Design a protein around this nucleic acid. Structure first.
Lengths: 237, 171, 82, 128
DNA sequence: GGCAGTACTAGTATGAAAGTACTTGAGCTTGATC
């Protein structure tokens, strides 16, 4: 669980919502979560998220206590500048596997190495050696590469490595706006890598960490599995 | 690259073809079914050179078609990464190079063109040239490319080439 | 095996005559040339049954002996039981 | 995984023989003459047509006998079908260029020797 | 007007078969040693 990471509250109307860990409590009891409220401002009560309209809740009244942008309302819910900032038990949230969406990032390092990929050494006296991954650990990978013309296994920390690739090999986009798309890399630039997708020849330029070596042919189906490229759709009646 | 190999086929004959011209129909059926086709295993079947042997026909159970195994010699075209071949430029665009290698198409990415070859839209026929105007690549020119990768989408193969190495380009 | 030394019954077993009149009628039923003069016959099973009594059916039967070998009998060489 | 620049080809292409664009053109010309004459056969496919003009357009030895002599010339040299066929089709003029285009040739012969074969080819070339 | 406690509701978490085959234990016989 990390501060400013995103977790999902287990219960309430806020159940499953992506929420940012505003504050990790030292006691490890609760965490302050940044949410967008799902409230009717007690007008309907004798819903989709919307930014907290402090003026509206004041208009509706009820349990409202304004203190600047910080406002306390109905059940000591805390809000500030349109968002919620309320503590929730750590036991009450889902701390792992959450991952915000890009949209959630708008609302509110990493290492990925797999045995079999070709990597390059970015620094050190061992710089510009390329080789294939034997094994992997989470930080100092102790990536045990088998470098070209080297029968020995060395150890490299993740931070010392990058995912290299000569032009013409198949690549997959691991994470990004393009993730799931595949292609052959035509040209490699400093940290820049350009490639043509398999589905369409429309160009793609991505960072060196966002590609991996996988020999599989392109899927041809969107995330969600409902639609696929080249299909007929109804846009409006 | 062009090859001369031995291939096989199963000719499914509709029952109407039977009668007198039976063996002849198999050969004519074969020529029509394999010539022009392409596969990932062998590539483009350019033409059937000779028919070595015709297998005894076996009635397929539950269907009218009877299958005659056929051994034939054919000419195939199967490209490989790193091989240099001559192509004809067919179209100049600001997006890259549209080329053709025999019956197979090949795309040369603009990113794989030396920086000296600026694209020039204002020229009468679109073309690719060096600012020095020394070398100009346009429609109908013969160029040397290196195949960087191949793909097979719906029995048809296409490739991607590059002009980054020395002694490539205009011929 | 050779045309000599064939060891099998010359008669057509009722299993072979069941699959011959079936396979032949399936061919006739798709535009296939008819060996025998057909007279008022729109039904393929009756046509294929007629070709059989006249021994006009163009099929050779491949009989696998149990040891892995085989023999090829044409439908004319065999003797129709019924 | 595979790469012709290192003569790593599939097992299937072992018993096969490479064909020069000139030889291909000849073979296609004979098959066409047969297709042409003896009617009652649909016109050939587009793949053919495109290949017929492309092969012709790049054929350097227009004479039957010449092609055979070139083939045999190289034949008596320790060459792999791929390396052989590639040099005959591209006909490079210098050892340097040759090695660059076909890296598998590195260390196979001395530049001098490679240039002898090249020079011989050039001599055999049926210029237009 | 606010905070704490209690109660209710919702969700989540756990007699009256027969036979055959295999394994284990006990007993008997043979071999080796004193």
């Amino acid at each position: 669980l990390k501060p400013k990471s995103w977790v999902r509250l287990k219960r309430g109307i806020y159940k499953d919502d992506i929420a940012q860990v505003d504050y990790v409590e030292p006691s490890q009891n609760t965490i302050s979560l940044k949410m967008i409220p799902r409230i009717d401002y007690d007008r309907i009560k004798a819903p989709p998220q919307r930014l907290f309209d402090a003026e509206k809740i004041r208009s509706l009244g009820g349990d409202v206590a304004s203190d600047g942008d910080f406002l306390i309302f109905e059940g000591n819910r805390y809000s500030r500048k349109g968002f919620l900032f309320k503590s929730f038990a750590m036991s009450a949230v889902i701390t792992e596997g959450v991952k915000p969406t890009l949209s959630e990032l708008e609302k509110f390092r990493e290492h990925n190495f797999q045995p079999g990929d070709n990597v390059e050494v970015c620094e050190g006296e061992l710089i510009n050696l390329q080789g294939k991954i034997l094994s992997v650990d989470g930080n100092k990978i102790t990536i045990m590469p088998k470098h070209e013309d080297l029968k020995d296994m060395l150890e490299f920390p993740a931070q010392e490595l990058r995912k290299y690739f000569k032009m013409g090999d198949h690549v997959k986009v691991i994470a990004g706006r393009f993730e799931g798309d595949t292609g052959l890399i035509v040209r490699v630039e400093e940290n820049f890598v350009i490639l043509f997708s398999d589905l369409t020849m429309h160009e793609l330029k991505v960072l060196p960490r966002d590609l991996q070596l996988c020999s599989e042919t392109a899927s041809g189906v969107d995330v969600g599995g409902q639609h696929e490229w080249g299909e007929l759709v109804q846009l409006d009646p | 690259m062009f090859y001369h190999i031995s291939l096989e086929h199963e000719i499914l004959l509709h029952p109407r073809y039977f009668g007198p011209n039976l063996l002849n129909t198999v050969k004519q059926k074969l020529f029509t079914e394999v010539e022009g086709t392409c596969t990932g295993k062998y590539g483009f079947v350019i033409a059937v050179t000779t028919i070595d042997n015709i297998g005894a026909g076996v009635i397929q159970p539950g269907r009218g078609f009877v299958l005659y195994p056929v051994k034939y010699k054919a000419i195939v075209f199967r490209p490989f990464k790193g091989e240099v071949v001559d192509a004809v430029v067919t179209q100049v665009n600001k997006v890259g190079l549209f080329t053709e290698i025999g019956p197979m198409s090949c795309f040369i990415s603009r990113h794989s063109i030396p920086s000296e070859m600026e694209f020039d839209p204002n020229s009468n026929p679109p073309c690719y040239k060096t600012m020095d105007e020394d070398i100009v690549i346009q429609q109908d020119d013969e160029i040397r490319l290196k195949i960087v990768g191949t793909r097979v989408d719906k029995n048809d193969i296409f490739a991607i080439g590059s002009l980054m190495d020395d002694y490539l380009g205009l011929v | 095996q050779a045309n000599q030394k064939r060891i099998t019954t010359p008669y057509m077993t009722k299993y072979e005559r069941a699959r011959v009149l079936g396979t032949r009628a399936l061919q006739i039923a798709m535009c296939a040339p008819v060996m025998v003069e057909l007279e008022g016959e729109t039904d393929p099973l009756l046509i294929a049954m007629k070709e059989l009594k006249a021994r006009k059916i163009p099929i050779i039967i491949r009989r696998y002996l149990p040891d892995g070998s085989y023999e090829d009998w044409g439908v004319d060489e065999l003797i129709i039981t019924d | 995984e595979e790469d012709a620049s290192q003569l790593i080809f599939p097992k299937e292409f072992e018993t096969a023989e490479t064909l020069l664009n000139s030889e291909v053109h000849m073979l296609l010309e004979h098959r066409k003459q047969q297709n042409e004459s003896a009617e009652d056969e649909q016109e050939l496919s587009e793949v053919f047509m495109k290949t017929l003009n492309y092969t012709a357009r790049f054929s350097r030895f227009k004479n039957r006998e010449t092609i055979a002599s070139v083939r045999s010339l190289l034949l008596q040299k320790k060459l792999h079908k791929f390396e052989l066929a590639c040099l005959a089709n591209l006909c490079p003029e210098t050892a340097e260029e040759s090695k660059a285009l076909i890296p598998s040739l590195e260390g196979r012969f001395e530049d001098e020797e490679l240039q002898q074969i090249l020079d011989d080819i050039q001599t055999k070339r049926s210029f237009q």
